[PDB]
């Protein structure tokens, strides 16, 4: 089986930088959650990153034709938060700055151990945000990268963010996460 707590040790035992840290963990989870590296199922991958970081276990995320099993309902239950402006990038802002400015909005609204679903450009893409007390760990277990704005290849922390790129932080209740842990969609997903 797989124990996230233990993976955090091996990762913490390494004096890696913030972004380099997220990337490696996401890359680790990616090999299990989304073994094909395929596209289309980011929503499910992000949800699964969340489950894993909440202690629910690590399961293969649904592939494209399984997304409607549970994700259609999730999407409706959070339409209000997805269809909003969210955090918009500043002109001439770099990826590292934008990332930091987004993590701030998250720390200032969540507690340790918590996680969030992060929608990029109103559900064009999805990644998960995990609070660890001090910093936030942006995870994209679909392609195994850290923070990104739906980038074919992870960009430099110095790269410029395209004008008014938006990101919506999605607060998901424990009731929502538990309802999924009980669904048959979650239970039919391969463990680890």
């Amino acid at each position: 089986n797989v124990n996230v707590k233990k993976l955090l040790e091996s990762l913490n035992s390494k004096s890696l930088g913030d972004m380099d840290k997220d990337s490696e963990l996401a890359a680790t989870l990616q090999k299990m959650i989304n073994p094909s590296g395929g596209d289309g199922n980011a929503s499910g991958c992000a949800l699964h990153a969340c489950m894993a970081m909440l202690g629910y276990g690590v399961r293969e995320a649904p592939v494209p034709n399984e997304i409607s099993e549970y994700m259609t309902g999730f999407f409706h239950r959070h339409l209000e938060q997805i269809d909003s402006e969210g955090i918009v990038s500043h002109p001439n802002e770099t990826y590292s700055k934008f990332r930091e400015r987004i993590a701030e909005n998250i720390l200032q609204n969540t507690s340790k151990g918590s996680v969030v679903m992060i929608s990029i450009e109103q559900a064009t893409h999805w990644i998960a945000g995990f609070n660890d007390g001090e910093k936030i760990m942006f995870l994209d277990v679909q392609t195994g990268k850290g923070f990104n704005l739906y980038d074919p290849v992870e960009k430099s922390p110095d790269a410029f963010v395209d004008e008014n790129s938006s990101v919506q932080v999605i607060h998901v209740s424990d009731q929502e996460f538990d309802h999924y842990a009980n669904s048959s969609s979650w239970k039919s997903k391969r463990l680890c």
Partner: protein, 151 residues
């Protein structure tokens, strides 16, 4: 609002940074329509062809599924005479959680590997199953006729 940023974003990447082997152009009169072109995959019976597809985004998209159909005739077990595509995620498996990019990638994958598990019985499907070799000769010929010198 209707996720205005998502529509703008998906449209933007389809027009600027599409999946390799796929390209598009906006419809001069209606902004909800897109003229898509997919290259026949190398090593497939459609290699060398350029297939036209019509992508339409209904009012309720993404709650409502996007509409895609071939505008170029093709001999494929999963595409009918009117160019309708038998793809689960374009029908009852679509979800607002999905993306337009997923649909195009699947259609493209369909060209390199026709899906045999299709409940819709049709003459072309039967021949691909029963007479694969003859079916492939036919597909290559239809590619040379409909999918070449057509753009």
């Amino acid at each position: 609002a209707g996720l205005p940023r998502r529509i703008i974003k998906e449209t933007q990447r389809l027009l600027a940074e599409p999946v390799p082997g796929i390209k598009a152009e906006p419809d001069e009169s209606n902004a909800r329509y897109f003229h898509v072109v997919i290259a026949g995959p190398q090593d497939s019976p459609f290699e060398g062809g350029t297939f036209k597809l019509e992508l339409f985004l209904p009012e309720e998209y993404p709650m409502a599924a996007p509409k895609v159909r071939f505008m170029t005739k093709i001999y494929h077990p999963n595409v009918d005479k009117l160019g309708r595509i038998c793809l689960d995620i374009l029908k009852d498996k679509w979800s607002p959680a999905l993306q337009i990019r997923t649909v195009l990638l699947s259609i493209q994958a369909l060209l390199s590997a026709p899906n045999p598990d299709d409940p819709l019985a049709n003459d072309v499907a039967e021949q691909w199953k029963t007479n694969e070799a003859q079916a492939i000769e036919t597909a290559r010929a239809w590619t040379r006729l409909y999918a070449m010198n057509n753009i």
